[PDB]
Amino acid sequence: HHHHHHQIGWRREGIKYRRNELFLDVLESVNLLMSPQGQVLSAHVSGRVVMKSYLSGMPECKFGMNDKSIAIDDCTFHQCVRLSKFDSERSISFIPPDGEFELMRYRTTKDIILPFRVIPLVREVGRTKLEVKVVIKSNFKPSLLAQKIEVRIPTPLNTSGVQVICMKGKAKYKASENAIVWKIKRMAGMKESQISAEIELLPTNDKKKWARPPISMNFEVPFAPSGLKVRYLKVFEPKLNYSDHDVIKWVRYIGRSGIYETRCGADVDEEGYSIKPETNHFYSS
Numbered sequence: 001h002h003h004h005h006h007q008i009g010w011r012r013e014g015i016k017y018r019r020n021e022l023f024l025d026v027l028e029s030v031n032l033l034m035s036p037q038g039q040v041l042s043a044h045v046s047g048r049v050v051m052k053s054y055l056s057g058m059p060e061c062k063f064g065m066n067d068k069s070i071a072i073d074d075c076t077f078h079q080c081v082r083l084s085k086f087d088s089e090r091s092i093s094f095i096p097p098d099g100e101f102e103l104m105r106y107r108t109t110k111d112i113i114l115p116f117r118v119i120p121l122v123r124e125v126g127r128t129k130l131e132v133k134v135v136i137k138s139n140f141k142p143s144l145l146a147q148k149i150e151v152r153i154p155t156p157l158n159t160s161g162v163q164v165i166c167m168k169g170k171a172k173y174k175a176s177e178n179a180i181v182w183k184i185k186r187m188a189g190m191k192e193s194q195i196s197a198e199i200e201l202l203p204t205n206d207k208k209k210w211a212r213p214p215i216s217m218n219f220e221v222p223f224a225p226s227g228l229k230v231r232y233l234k235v236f237e238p239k240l241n242y243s244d245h246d247v248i249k250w251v252r253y254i255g256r257s258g259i260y261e262t263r264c265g266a267d268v269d270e271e272g273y274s275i276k277p278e279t280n281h282f283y284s285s
Contacts (some may be wrong), residue, residue, distance in 0.1 A: 004181055008058075010080060010097045016056055016273045019283075021248040023052035024233065030112065030225035033214075036120055036263050043112050045226045046258070048105040051151035055247065057237045063092040063103065063233035070224070099267075100110040108226040115140055115221045115255065118151070127207075130156070132197035132264075134182075134215065140189035140223060147220040149184040151195070152177075153264075154213040158202045165196040188272035199252065208277035212266035221255035228253075246284055 027048035035041055049063075068090065077083065078101055080094035092104070116136055123131040134153060138146060149169070155162065155178050162173045162180065169184030182195050230251050235244040267274050276285065 008080075008095060011058065011095060012098070012263040013058065015098050016271075017054050017246070018120070018273055019054070020056055020242065020246060020285075021054050022233065022235075023050075023054075023111075023250045024230055025050040025052075025137070025249075026224050026228055026230065026253045027256070028113065028220075028224050028226055028228075028254070029256045030260065032114060032260045032262070034118065034262040036265055038117060038119070040114075043109065043114065044111055045108040045224075046105070047108065047224065047226055047228065049103040050098045050100065051103045053098060054274070055096070055235065055237075055241045056242075058095055059235045059237045061065060061094050061096055062232070063094075063189055065092070066227070066229040069106060069111065069228045070228040071110040073107045074107055075104050077104050078102060106226075107133055108179075108228075111227055113140065113223070113225050115146060115225060115228055116149075116217060116219060116260070118215055118217065118262035120215055120262060122212075122264050123143075127170070127203040128201055130197075130199040132180075132199060133194065134197075134264075135192060136187075136217075138187055138189045138191050140221070142189045142191075144222050146187050146189075146191050146222075147185065148185055148218065150218040151182040152216045153182065153195070153197065154215070154281040155179060155199060156201065156210045158204055159199055160202045161200040163198050165241040166194070168193040169244045171195055210266075212246065213266055214263050215263035217257055217260045219257045219260070222253055223255055224253045225255045 004072045016164055028045050030045045033042035080096055082093045085091040086091050116138060119135040125131060132153060162182055164171045164173060166182060169182060171180055171182040173180050180197060233244060233249055235247055269275055
């Protein structure tokens with residue numbers, strides 16, 4: 001009974017790391033079309049899990065998710081994942097490639113945590129004025145902070161001048177872009193902010209009702225709008241004898257805005273050790 005030799009094409013043998021560790025990045029884009037009254041007309045999240053594996057040997061990994069939450073409509077796995085166990089047990093088990101790879105990508109349309117509601121109100125005062133007020137609510141944990149928030153409010157062509165007021169961030173009228181651009185650096189959850197706009201209009205000869213573009217928003221969020229949460233990443237190397245109890249896990253959720261709209265009334269060193277790449281923690285290089 002001679003035994004076969006196991007050669008995996010995506011991971012060589014003899015990977016040695018001074019410090020066993022791994023990175024998990026849950027990257028997601030949330031998309032939205034919301035009515036002016038707050039009705040979700042469309043919404044979806046595309047996401048993927050990027051793993052950087054700086055582990056030694058041939059480690060056996062089991063990635064655990066908060067799904068028996070996140071409702072997954074369809075997902076494609078990297079070849080390393082054992083498709084048999086995900087069929088029956090819903091387990092994600094693999095010996096990962098060395099370095100960075102995409103463990104899975106997925107799509108979500110249900111139970112989506114929309115990080116921002118935009119409540120718009122545009123009032124008409126004759127053909128020479130247009131009074132705009134826009135509120136944004138952050139509907140996540142107060143513990144968390146959103147970055148790079150930008151709100152785009154469309155202005156009609158015949159805008160002759162705007163005076164804008166806000167108490168958060170900055171708001172500049174960009175006539176070439178036909179928009180008021182409202183940039184906020186940071187904002188916590190369960191909060192509100194508001195912008196005020198008095199827009200002056202030159203009346204035209206049409207009296208054709210202005211067909212509004214939607215109000216769009218850009219932002220980053222430190223969680224997954226799909227609701228996905230990393231429960232565990234168990235590791236076991238049988239030959240070197242180490243488990244995830246001996247490993248450092250670095251986990252990060254980056255939630256991005258995709259099209260988020262709301263209508264407004266319309267490698268090895270000398271000794272055989274692999275070197276990590278480079279780019280404030282007690283254990284980071």
